Design goal:
This is part of a larger assembly, with three copies of chain A (516 residues).
Chain A (H helix, E strand, L loop, with lengths): L12 E4 L3 E12 L8 E5 L10 E10 L11 H8 L2 E24 L2 E6 L5 E6 L23 E3 L2 E6 L23 E3 L5 E6 L9 E3 L16 E6 L5 E5 L17 E2 L4 E2 L9 E2 L6 E3 L4 E3 L7 E2 L7 E2 L6 E3 L16 E3 L10 E2 L5 E4 L11 E4 L1 E2 L19 E3 L5 E2 L9 E3 L5 E6 L20 E17 L24 E2 L5 E2 L9 E3 L2
Parallel strand pairs in A: 2-8, 12-35, 20-24, 28-30
Antiparallel strand pairs in A: 1-2, 2-32, 3-4, 4-9, 4-31, 5-6, 5-11, 5-32, 7-10, 7-31, 13-14, 15-27, 16-21, 18-19, 22-23, 25-26, 33-34
């Protein structure tokens, strides 16, 4: 209620309750006064020789809350207890609560930066629950809540890129500008707090199970099919047929088919017999959209890199995390030992691999003169009767994404993994209100001299997850995420002597196994 | 009730009522006695050198009502008030009402064509609401209600093409014949009327908004992704990775993908550097269906001609209306100045252009010997995680179409734009009953001499439209359909000194703008 | 209630509710301690060679709130949605609310200006709702709420000019002095707020429609009048008459007449064939009032500059805004490219142009000796049966004005446009209470050493607007305010890379069209 009273407590826990788990998480944040309290016009042309990077947009002084990663809510033990016990999970509700606001004021006088707090300065928070702003949350950007609870994170500055003109930095007449002070926002002093509740829409469970059985090997290898296959022609043009035998899965009749494919390049990790000195930009899979051509990693769902125990990965198809957060705007050439190169090997009985051709189809009509000929294709889209698996979600990866408000779409599983939401959690924007400096006269030009200041405080996020319980009559034990290190020099998913949070490997969800 | 009393009034109006608009429209029609009151066998072989044009079918004396265009219900001002204020619209109900029937009888005696009315002759009207007839309404044919209310239109003759045999004019044993006098029809004198009500099924709203934001540019250009991309290999085969920077949309990880594509040829309008003297038939995109090969304009949804401000259009992908209705069976070579060549430039942030390749995929497996190679594809079908925009509807274009009664289908947006209906508005068939001439003796052969006669009357159509209200926090003004002509020599969407209804340009729906 | 609690939230929105729109707007203000807390005697003589500029008056330490411009309440999109959809609008209620007061105290010690806040200092606010003060709000002065919500504005100092004597700086015995601490004012600490409600009186709607039809062309051009005109005399003095034909509007009988006129000088913008090197002061239209002569722009209602598509404007008749707010007291010679020269071309079917003579009247009595002669007049006042159009209101222009408390008036449309109010919104005056410095002894002279200090805070203004709905049976589309720029280098009505709010063109209201 006032300055000498706590406006909320530290809730950071998890409570497994049957087929349901709430996951609370309080973090501490810092909000810089971005742009010195003004809207700016960020724009760029073709950098790196590509006019795909040309954008037009606006950068606001508003910061925002991005709790759209799984480690922001899940400890690695509560993640381990999830992915080794349950076949699925999906979010149900959400409860965000910003509290203990305190706003300092830096006063650099003769290089003595005194930092004191003003009790009177406010903080604006609104939530965009009519979805009228550019939703920039679900795009794999930084500025998230940290994985580790005693880390203090700075809130990312809110910008958005509108329509540019002809792949330049210049706008078009459809390019918009959203003023964010034209939205009603709650003014928060140091004794006020901002609560917010949200209920997720009906989404499918994330299929956190690996297949126990190949897709083209769903018949039993004991009894044989009552269907025959064309095998050959005789010395005349008379066709000949053979019975599909029992375990001959290469030529049985299939009833279901794998998912989409676009053949990406496969690069060897580990030892590697890769091509030396490849500038890997000019040969990636691009998807040209209204002018320029864009790299689109990862490719849409229905494929996999990395078959099984092979060091060949499709690096265009994968999600490559770093081990630690990096400095912004770095041009460092990281190697294999720095990254978390993340495999989708668990879905190979259903999905086709991305560094191999998917099949072959007949190219000509045969005759007594022309022999039959086939040709391999590098990409195949949705066929009726297809079945694929969605992208695996990770502890270090995004939870949701917003479906773009277009006319139509085909089934909206995000390519980066997670939950495709039509009405996602609304984007909580926040800024410091501008406090003017010493203004002694009237002028019609607006104030450009402000008290330089930042605010800080805590935020708690309480999600709730409906879980799909495992129910299998499998006899032998399964593979599960065990803590298996040979001679650990450090405890993983735990700090070090420096005090930085050390993660080494990404953690999937498909560890339970389930027959098709 | 009788001959001296009006059997219905002229309702032609529109009543905007919140998120709902009823649009009434009365027109005056003329019904010729088609075929001289008999069923005939229309059939043809390969004309224009193509056996696709070979059909077998039947032509009835029945005429029909085709109010399946948007200008039959919408004035251009009420269309302007729709497409500049609302994000969507869909039909809800329908009410057709045929009234003031009067049937003349032409009597050419010594070249003095006296036209008098017989009070006793009837008119048959039935509606086909069990969908047992070939539904020929939603196919882009003429004979519609006019755009302009005081125009009198003639009702189109009802024919249908059944199954022919082996791309000839001869029938197969599956070819059917539907007698239309085997359906119960209401006999209408000059004092009778025919009412009919219809409620549309649950359809999606037509997305009458343009995107404010590119599909591959949905991240913000301020914070950068926590995902890395394979960039290159070193002097060994060791892979190397770089962080996806903030605004580098050409190589970020994408979550949603564009729609289908088939690469069509792009032709330059305006000035034009087109290839001179092209017979443009042999190089169009065809789709061979059970024998012959058919041109299929427009190609299915998910593409666009005409990027932005460029004079290159994909003429195979577009809807080309004329400015005025034309005489039937004309072989005139119209030019650019006659037609209404209709752009889909508003959907280019989501759809791929039809005169460019959509992307490229890896063609080989790399090694220390073989370098990586990619290959461009000209067509890509549905991939899971796709999102496209539907075809824009126009003031001069069709409202609905019937889904064919087959087994299965994929999401039934008609390629010509509009609303894919499973149970469309039933086809109102109408004919003049045959009045025999002077028959003085009995003969078992049926009567072939009739009183030559036509009927005329009014028809009113009352549709009802549920509207999706615009709700955006966009700050700057939008583009809207304004009446912008530089030195008009005539008022557009209004008559001239001749009295003919002059339209110059087609009117879309996507003028409001909305972020993905 | 206290220092650690927010005393009000940021309301800044608009809610269109049928034929009604509320427009909330919160801004942040800075209040300097004007005059160092004392009343002063501002007076001047003849500057610029004109004794019209000689005034006597008083300058107070009070600042005031001036939300009397349309952009203080309306975003340009909500202004666009108004002027393209409605035929009229007028204010109904008002709700001002000053909150989050915080008062700093600047302490310059050895050129180290430390700015800290005192929790104990107060702020006086009263509202003048008996109209006992000189109302200086509705006069086109600066110090308004900004157009753009995150701009912080400084409150203008309240002064007023009373009666001087004989066009000098000396007062007369009727010259008054209003002490503003003789009015009861609410003392506001940092935990207090000041609410205020107001209901506007019955005013006419602002006619935000252009005429679709000329005033002298209201007959139809098909049938002719039953009234004859004197055309000529014969070889004798016998009069002769002709019938007024159908479309001959130059000599039909008129029933209604245009508004007032005073011929101003017309100057060419754009290319321009203007007279070179004109000191444009000595030839303007003046209106001499009790001694001196005053320029009176704009001239009273009933005229227009700028016919249609011509570059000749009457610059004495127009409202010339700047693109950006300017520094106070500037003597800069702005050009055409800086200003927002604002046209009244939309009202030319009803109003007469200001750079042309309005008509001619007979100067002599004719005879057999003297021929008839006419003479053009340069000004014509109200004639019974007149009809004119009021001044267009703009997004950048004033909302209301106070009618002077005189005896009588003729219909009080303000010449600067807007709503003539008899009891306007009361003028919210505000000052910082004086906190004395170090006073160690008693003296009967009042304290002149104070703690130098300023206060800041937020103010929200909630107006409510009754709207006149458009209802026209016009067929063709209208002209509307579209966002039409050819190659934009910047988004208009939105910031730039500097962060300043960029407006280029003024926005009217007459875009709908309506017949007389």
């Amino acid at each position: 209620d006032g300055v000498g009273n706590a406006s909320g407590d530290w809730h950071c826990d998890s409570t497994w309750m049957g087929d349901r788990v709430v996951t609370k998480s309080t973090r501490t944040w810092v909000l810089p006064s971005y742009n010195n309290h003004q809207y700016r016009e960020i724009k760029s042309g073709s950098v790196d020789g590509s006019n795909a990077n040309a954008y037009f947009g606006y950068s606001t002084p508003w910061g925002y809350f991005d709790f759209n990663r799984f480690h922001s809510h899940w400890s690695p033990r509560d993640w381990q207890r999830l992915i080794n016990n349950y076949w699925g999970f999906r979010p149900r509700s959400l409860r965000v609560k910003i509290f203990n606001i305190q706003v300092k004021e830096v006063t650099v006088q003769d290089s003595t930066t005194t930092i004191a707090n003003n009790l009177t300065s406010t903080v604006q928070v609104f939530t965009d629950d009519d979805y009228q702003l550019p939703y920039v949350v679900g795009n794999g950007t930084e500025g998230c809540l940290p994985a580790f609870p005693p880390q203090v994170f700075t809130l990312p500055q809110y910008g958005y890129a509108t329509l540019n003109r002809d792949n330049t930095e210049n706008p078009t007449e459809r390019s918009s500008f959203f003023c964010l002070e034209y939205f009603p926002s709650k003014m928060l002093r140091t004794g006020n707090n901002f609560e917010f509740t949200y209920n997720f829409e009906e989404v499918p469970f994330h299929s956190s199970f690996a297949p126990s059985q190949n897709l083209f090997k769903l018949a039993n290898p004991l009894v044989d099919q009552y269907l025959y296959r064309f095998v050959s022609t005789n010395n005349t043009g008379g066709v000949q047929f053979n019975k599909n035998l029992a375990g001959r899965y290469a030529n049985t009749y299939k009833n279901w088919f794998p998912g989409p494919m676009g053949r990406t390049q496969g690069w060897n990790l580990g030892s590697g017999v890769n091509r030396a000195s490849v500038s890997a930009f000019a040969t990636t899979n691009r998807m040209e959209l209204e002018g320029a051509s864009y790299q689109v990693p990862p490719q849409p769902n229905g494929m996999t890199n990395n078959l099984q125990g092979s060091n060949t990965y499709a690096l265009e198809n994968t999600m490559i995390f770093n081990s630690q957060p990096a400095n912004p705007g770095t041009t460092a050439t990281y190697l294999e030992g720095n990254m978390l190169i993340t495999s989708e090997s668990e879905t190979q009985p259903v999905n086709r691999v991305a560094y191999n051709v998917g099949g072959q189809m007949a190219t000509n009509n045969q005759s007594s003169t022309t022999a039959p000929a086939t040709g391999t294709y590098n990409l195949q889209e949705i066929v009726p009767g297809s079945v694929w698996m969605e992208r695996d979600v990770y502890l270090q990866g995004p939870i949701w994404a917003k479906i773009p408000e277009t006319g139509a779409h085909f089934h909206p599983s995000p390519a980066m993994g997670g939950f495709g939401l039509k009405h996602p959690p609304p984007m909580m924007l926040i800024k410091n209100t501008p406090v003017p400096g010493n203004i002694t006269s009237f002028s019609d030009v607006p104030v450009s001299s402000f008290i330089t200041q930042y605010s800080t405080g805590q935020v708690t996020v309480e999600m709730e997850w409906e879980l799909k319980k495992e129910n299998s009559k499998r006899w032998n034990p399964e593979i599960q995420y065990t803590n298996n290190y040979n001679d650990p020099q450090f405890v993983d998913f735990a700090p070090d002597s420096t005090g930085e949070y050390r993660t080494t490997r990404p953690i999937g969800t498909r560890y339970l196994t389930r027959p098709l």
